[PDB]
Design a protein around this ligand. Structure first.
Ligand code: UDP
Ligand code: UDP
Ligand code: MG
Ligand code: MG
Ligand code: MG
Ligand code: MG
Ligand code: MG
Lengths: 211, 214
């Protein structure tokens, strides 16, 4: 019974082929989840489920789409009473023995009760902030002078327990328009010690974003 | 004239020895700046210079001390009309060729107009994360299950232009108690789409905090 969902724009043929290839070559079942893109459907979903986010001028509609995709998958976890769901974004590369973690679930069931509130990150945890190149100020001693353009965190591969799905849906629902930030920044900022929400990290990681 | 200042609690002997060792071994001049700590002095400085921060329950007094230390160094930059000042925290480790960047400033003077508003980060630029080991949930397939938390991003090594010192002093002075946030968030994250204020990052970095290397 399938736990792995890959968020992917329906027309992203090159990414989907790479995902198919990777999952089939390790014999890991999965389904694509058709990512929300700028569209009437996304507009409607924002208005109905996250009215606060629809108003947030600080995010691109694409960022709102990615957020909505994660959020609806969490909702699926609740609605279908799944113990956990494993979410990916469609540019991950699976590491070597990933099938021991993703084709089989007993290792998780033996370790956690799924009403516990946790995420288990499967992707790398050493991630650079997003830097832009610039051409006007020359490098010095073979070091570039780049411009910081955002704090970037991975939401490309993680297990979320039913408990954590409930917690995150409630959290995202309660955020005001002013508090909205990209999903990765919201989730990054939730990773603190004074809460019931616990974030575990697989170390070393078993997948990584392509670029 | 010295541009490098290392923020350090006056009694922090082990850190100061490590800083002395590192800077002297690469022949980089610097001065210690006595960090503000929870104390009468910090309380008084908060009340006089940053009254809205004294009330801010979202920062610990220690964090307010670190903030006050940076802030008074920016004020020094303004009072002394320095083109730039280069600030470190007392846990940095200098990279290999750090002296090419820190012992002299000509490479900066030929590159930037210091009336422009910018900070140039010198330290590593990974998302600020820490892993706690735990033994109660067993590893699987030779992979540990660690506990992951976020921490503040580094303010442990950066060059700040006079323009940016003026801008940040003005900004911090105007923030209400509710708007106060960690220094890193105010300096870096919140200014990403500011009209004049730029944050540059030296890539690859030339220094790293003792804790981030680990
Ligand atoms: O309009 C969009 C654009 C992207 N995505 C999803 O966002 C994820 C991350 O996309 P990408 O790697 O392009 O973004 P980045 O990692 O650059 O933030 C992918 O799963 C996409 O399918 C989405 O739901 N809606
Ligand atoms: O009350 C204090 C405690 C610390 N610091 C300074 O804050 C900087 C960073 O301290 P640390 O590396 O302990 O913390 P982090 O990098 O986690 O913010 C150092 O220069 C300390 O001297 C300070 O100004 N006041
Ligand atoms: Mg990506
Ligand atoms: Mg992302
Ligand atoms: Mg933070
Ligand atoms: Mg700090
Ligand atoms: Mg530090």
């Amino acid at each position: 019974e399938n736990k792995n969902f890959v968020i992917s724009i329906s027309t992203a043929e090159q990414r989907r082929n790479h995902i198919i290839e990777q999952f089939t070559h390790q014999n890991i079942p999965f389904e694509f989840f058709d990512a929300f893109t700028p569209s009437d459907k996304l507009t409607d979903h924002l208005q109905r489920y996250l009215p606060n986010v629809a108003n947030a001028a600080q995010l691109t509609m694409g960022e709102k789409g990615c957020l909505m995709s994660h959020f609806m998958l969490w909702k699926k976890c609740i609605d279908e009473n799944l113990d956990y769901i494993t979410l990916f974004e469609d540019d991950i590369l699976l590491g070597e023995n990933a099938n021991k973690f993703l084709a089989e679930g007993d290792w998780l069931k033996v370790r956690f009760n799924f009403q516990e509130i946790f995420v288990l990150r499967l992707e790398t945890f050493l991630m650079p902030v997003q830097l832009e190149k610039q051409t006007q100020i020359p490098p010095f001693q073979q070091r570039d002078i780049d411009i910081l353009t955002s704090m970037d965190w991975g939401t490309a591969g993680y297990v979320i327990s039913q408990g954590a799905a409930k917690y995150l849906i409630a959290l995202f629902e309660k955020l005001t328009t002013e508090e909205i930030m990209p999903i990765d920044e919201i989730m990054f900022n939730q990773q603190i010690n004074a809460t019931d929400y616990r974030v575990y990290q697989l170390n070393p990681a078993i997948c990584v974003q392509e670029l």
